[PDB]
Ligand binder design. Sequence first.
Ligand SMILES: NC(=O)c1ccccc1
Length: 165
Amino acid sequence: MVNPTVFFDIAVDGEPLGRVSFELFADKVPKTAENFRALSTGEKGFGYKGSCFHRIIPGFMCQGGDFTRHNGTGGKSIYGEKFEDENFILKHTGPGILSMANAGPNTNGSQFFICTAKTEWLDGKHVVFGKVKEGMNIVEAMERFGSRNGKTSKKITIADCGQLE
Ligand SMILES: NC(=O)c1ccccc1
Protein backbone atom coordinates (compact mmCIF):
# COMPACT_ATOMS: atom_id res chain seq x y z
CA MET A 1 0.00 0.00 0.00
CA VAL A 2 1.50 3.36 -1.06
CA ASN A 3 0.51 6.27 1.27
CA PRO A 4 -2.47 8.08 -0.31
CA THR A 5 -2.16 11.57 -1.72
CA VAL A 6 -4.96 14.14 -1.60
CA PHE A 7 -5.27 17.55 -3.23
CA PHE A 8 -7.04 20.78 -2.34
CA ASP A 9 -7.64 23.39 -5.00
CA ILE A 10 -7.60 26.69 -3.12
CA ALA A 11 -9.59 29.82 -3.97
CA VAL A 12 -9.32 33.34 -2.52
CA ASP A 13 -12.67 35.20 -2.63
CA GLY A 14 -13.72 32.64 -5.25
CA GLU A 15 -10.67 33.30 -7.49
CA PRO A 16 -8.46 30.22 -8.13
CA LEU A 17 -5.07 30.35 -6.38
CA GLY A 18 -3.48 26.92 -6.84
CA ARG A 19 -3.29 23.32 -5.71
CA VAL A 20 -1.87 21.96 -2.49
CA SER A 21 -1.28 18.19 -2.32
CA PHE A 22 -0.65 16.09 0.78
CA GLU A 23 0.86 12.74 1.55
CA LEU A 24 -1.17 11.02 4.28
CA PHE A 25 0.89 8.76 6.54
CA ALA A 26 -1.44 5.74 6.44
CA ASP A 27 1.63 3.56 7.19
CA LYS A 28 1.87 5.29 10.66
CA VAL A 29 -1.65 6.59 11.48
CA PRO A 30 -4.01 4.62 9.22
CA LYS A 31 -7.23 5.55 11.05
CA THR A 32 -6.44 9.29 11.06
CA ALA A 33 -5.11 9.29 7.48
CA GLU A 34 -8.32 7.46 6.40
CA ASN A 35 -10.49 10.04 7.96
CA PHE A 36 -8.77 12.89 6.10
CA ARG A 37 -8.66 10.92 2.84
CA ALA A 38 -12.39 10.12 2.88
CA LEU A 39 -13.33 13.72 3.90
CA SER A 40 -11.24 14.86 0.93
CA THR A 41 -13.01 12.62 -1.63
CA GLY A 42 -16.49 13.20 -0.02
CA GLU A 43 -17.22 9.49 -0.37
CA LYS A 44 -19.17 9.28 2.92
CA GLY A 45 -21.55 12.04 1.76
CA PHE A 46 -19.78 14.89 3.58
CA GLY A 47 -16.31 16.46 3.70
CA TYR A 48 -14.09 19.31 2.91
CA LYS A 49 -15.18 20.46 -0.55
CA GLY A 50 -16.41 24.09 -0.39
CA SER A 51 -15.32 24.61 3.22
CA CYS A 52 -12.86 27.39 4.26
CA PHE A 53 -9.72 27.97 6.17
CA HIS A 54 -11.39 29.95 8.98
CA ARG A 55 -8.26 30.68 11.09
CA ILE A 56 -4.99 31.58 9.60
CA ILE A 57 -2.10 32.99 11.65
CA PRO A 58 1.10 33.92 9.72
CA GLY A 59 4.18 32.30 11.19
CA PHE A 60 2.00 29.64 12.86
CA MET A 61 -0.59 27.64 10.90
CA CYS A 62 -3.63 27.58 8.59
CA GLN A 63 -6.63 25.84 10.09
CA GLY A 64 -9.73 24.48 8.39
CA GLY A 65 -11.95 21.49 8.09
CA ASP A 66 -15.04 22.83 9.87
CA PHE A 67 -17.73 22.09 7.26
CA THR A 68 -20.65 22.17 9.67
CA ARG A 69 -20.23 25.54 11.48
CA HIS A 70 -17.56 27.22 9.28
CA ASN A 71 -15.88 28.87 12.27
CA GLY A 72 -13.86 26.36 14.32
CA THR A 73 -16.78 25.08 16.46
CA GLY A 74 -17.91 22.20 14.20
CA GLY A 75 -17.05 19.36 11.86
CA LYS A 76 -17.31 15.62 12.26
CA SER A 77 -15.19 12.58 11.54
CA ILE A 78 -16.11 9.59 9.34
CA TYR A 79 -16.28 7.54 12.61
CA GLY A 80 -18.76 9.59 14.61
CA GLU A 81 -18.59 13.12 15.96
CA LYS A 82 -15.16 12.51 17.40
CA PHE A 83 -12.49 9.87 17.59
CA GLU A 84 -9.54 9.01 19.76
CA ASP A 85 -5.93 10.12 19.44
CA GLU A 86 -4.53 7.32 17.36
CA ASN A 87 -0.87 7.70 18.34
CA PHE A 88 1.77 10.48 18.57
CA ILE A 89 4.50 8.80 16.60
CA LEU A 90 4.95 11.76 14.26
CA LYS A 91 6.04 15.20 15.45
CA HIS A 92 5.45 18.82 14.43
CA THR A 93 8.82 19.25 12.80
CA GLY A 94 8.26 22.27 10.58
CA PRO A 95 6.26 24.03 7.89
CA GLY A 96 4.01 21.69 5.89
CA ILE A 97 3.05 19.32 8.67
CA LEU A 98 -0.65 18.28 8.66
CA SER A 99 -2.14 17.79 12.13
CA MET A 100 -5.53 17.29 13.69
CA ALA A 101 -7.15 20.12 15.65
CA ASN A 102 -8.77 19.12 18.95
CA ALA A 103 -10.26 20.46 22.14
CA GLY A 104 -8.84 17.94 24.58
CA PRO A 105 -7.77 14.29 24.62
CA ASN A 106 -9.55 12.06 22.15
CA THR A 107 -11.57 14.76 20.42
CA ASN A 108 -10.48 14.53 16.79
CA GLY A 109 -13.19 15.46 14.28
CA SER A 110 -12.63 16.86 10.78
CA GLN A 111 -10.71 20.06 11.66
CA PHE A 112 -7.02 20.09 10.88
CA PHE A 113 -4.20 22.53 10.48
CA ILE A 114 -1.27 22.97 8.13
CA CYS A 115 1.84 24.16 10.00
CA THR A 116 3.72 27.15 8.56
CA ALA A 117 6.33 26.99 11.33
CA LYS A 118 7.74 24.34 13.68
CA THR A 119 5.09 23.88 16.44
CA GLU A 120 6.88 21.44 18.74
CA TRP A 121 4.83 22.35 21.84
CA LEU A 122 1.93 20.44 20.12
CA ASP A 123 3.93 17.17 20.05
CA GLY A 124 2.15 14.49 21.98
CA LYS A 125 -1.10 16.43 21.99
CA HIS A 126 -2.10 16.83 18.34
CA VAL A 127 -2.00 13.81 16.07
CA VAL A 128 0.32 14.49 13.00
CA PHE A 129 -0.85 12.48 10.03
CA GLY A 130 0.54 13.93 6.80
CA LYS A 131 2.55 16.59 5.10
CA VAL A 132 2.31 18.99 2.15
CA LYS A 133 3.83 17.28 -0.91
CA GLU A 134 3.31 19.92 -3.58
CA GLY A 135 2.13 23.53 -3.39
CA MET A 136 3.79 24.79 -0.19
CA ASN A 137 4.07 28.03 -2.26
CA ILE A 138 0.24 28.00 -2.37
CA VAL A 139 0.12 27.49 1.41
CA GLU A 140 2.52 30.51 1.76
CA ALA A 141 0.15 32.59 -0.42
CA MET A 142 -2.79 31.51 1.71
CA GLU A 143 -1.04 32.42 4.85
CA ARG A 144 -0.67 36.12 3.70
CA PHE A 145 -4.44 36.44 3.98
CA GLY A 146 -4.33 35.67 7.71
CA SER A 147 -3.68 37.98 10.62
CA ARG A 148 -2.36 37.85 14.14
CA ASN A 149 -5.80 37.04 15.65
CA GLY A 150 -6.35 34.51 12.77
CA LYS A 151 -9.25 36.29 11.05
CA THR A 152 -8.69 36.12 7.27
CA SER A 153 -8.83 39.28 5.10
CA LYS A 154 -10.29 37.33 2.17
CA LYS A 155 -12.24 34.09 2.10
CA ILE A 156 -9.88 31.13 1.65
CA THR A 157 -11.84 28.14 0.39
CA ILE A 158 -11.30 24.57 -0.73
CA ALA A 159 -12.88 24.95 -4.15
CA ASP A 160 -12.27 21.33 -4.97
CA CYS A 161 -10.51 18.41 -3.41
CA GLY A 162 -10.00 14.69 -3.94
CA GLN A 163 -7.44 11.81 -4.13
CA LEU A 164 -4.64 11.70 -6.63
CA GLU A 165 -3.49 8.44 -8.21
N1 LIG B 1 -6.52 23.50 19.66
C1 LIG B 1 -6.41 23.31 18.32
O1 LIG B 1 -7.22 22.68 17.72
C2 LIG B 1 -5.28 23.88 17.57
C3 LIG B 1 -5.45 24.18 16.23
C4 LIG B 1 -4.31 24.70 15.58
C5 LIG B 1 -3.03 24.78 16.19
C6 LIG B 1 -2.89 24.44 17.54
C7 LIG B 1 -4.03 23.94 18.22
